[PDB]
Structure 1
Amino acid sequence: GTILIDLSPDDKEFQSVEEEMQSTVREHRDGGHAGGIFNRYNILKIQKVCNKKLWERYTHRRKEVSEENHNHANERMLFHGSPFVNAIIHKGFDERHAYIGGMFGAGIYFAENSSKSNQYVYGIGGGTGCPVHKDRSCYICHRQLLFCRVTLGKSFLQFSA
């Protein structure tokens, strides 16, 4: 039941999503090993993901969390990069999309830095890079990231390297 609706580049919504993508690029400690060497992106398309059943699943849970946290969902907009992007937009997030070996345990991981999510587009550590050229720093091939609505509720703070 998912449909994808293209946003026009003249649309305010396109422009505010592009600005969050571009302005949250940083340098990474691996020198570009996982995600490539870059300071900015060429945005090719932005699409709104529309699925009534998946939206109602999200809002049902948001309301449960809010009622457990003094009517505060603590909702954020965060990036997610994954080899499973195509399954996620059709079926929603579930246990199959978790980073089993993540340093905060098996869960679904999201980033404020779009460039952090870019490291996972082709798999953990960048995998073997793009399928066509086997290049983690490929400048030709088209990549996809998700910009997601995320309910944090009461969040456990881990101070970490």
Structure 2
Amino acid sequence: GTILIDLSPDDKEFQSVEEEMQSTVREHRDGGHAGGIFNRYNILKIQKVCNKKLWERYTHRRKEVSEENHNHANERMLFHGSPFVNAIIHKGFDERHAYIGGMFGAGIYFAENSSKSNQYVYGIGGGTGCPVHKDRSCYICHRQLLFCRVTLGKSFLQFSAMAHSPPGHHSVTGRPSVNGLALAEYVIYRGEQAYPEYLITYQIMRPE
């Protein structure tokens, strides 16, 4: 029951999503090994992901979390990069899309930095890169990210360089503690706490 609606580049909604995508690129400590070498993207398409059942699944859980957290869902828009992007948009997030070996345990991981999520597009550590060229830094092949609505609720703060949420919390926040340019990363332990709202198709761009 998923349909994808293309946004026009003229639509303010397209523009605000592209701006989040572009302005949250950073340099990574792997020098580009996993995600490639780039300072910006070429955005090819932004589509709105519409699925009534998945949406109501999200909002049902959002209200539960909200009622357990003084009427505060603590909702963010965050990036998600995954080899499973096609299954996520049709079926929603579940345990099969968790990063089992993640530093905050087996959950589903999201990033404020688009360039962080870009590192998982072709798998953990960038896998073997793009299917066609086996190039983790491919400038030709089309990549896809999700920009997602994520319910954090009471988030456990972890200072740092499917399982369950820590008791009394609805999520974990990875607060970066040495790379002063890194933004936060987040983990949820229930698929129903994220809705894959925008599908963004793009290429990374070779720097000049």
> With structure 2 as the length reference, what TM-score do the two structures score?
0.76
Deviations 1:28-63 (A, max 9, x none): 000000000000000000000000000000000000
C-alpha deviation, 1:74, in angstroms? 0.1
Which runs of 5 or more structure 2 residues have no equivalent in the other structure? 160-208
Deviations 1:79-99 (A, max 9, x none): 000000000000000000000
Distance in 2 between residues matched to 1:79 and 1:67, nearest whole Å: 26
Distance in 2 between residues matched to 1:144 and 1:104, nearest whole Å: 24
Aligned positions, number? 159
Deviations 1:83-138 (A, max 9, x none): 00000000000000000000000000000000000000000000000000000000
Are 1:65 and 2:60 matched, yes or no?
no
Distance in 2 between residues matched to 1:56 and 1:33, nearest whole Å: 39
Distance in 1 between residues matched to 2:113 and 2:26, nearest whole Å: 7
**Greater than 6 Å deviation, 4+ residue runs:** none
C-alpha deviation, 1:144, in angstroms? 0.1
More helix by share: 1
Distance in 1 between residues matched to 2:115 and 2:33, nearest whole Å: 12
Distance in 2 between residues matched to 1:103 and 1:43, nearest whole Å: 30
2:155 is matched with which residue? 155
Which runs of 5 or more structure 1 residues have no equivalent in the other structure? none
2:86 is matched with which residue? 86
C-alpha deviation, 1:8, in angstroms? 0.1
Distance in 2 between residues matched to 1:81 and 1:37, nearest whole Å: 17
Percent identity, please. 100
Distance in 1 between residues matched to 2:96 and 2:77, nearest whole Å: 22
> With structure 1 as the length reference, what TM-score do the two structures score?
0.99
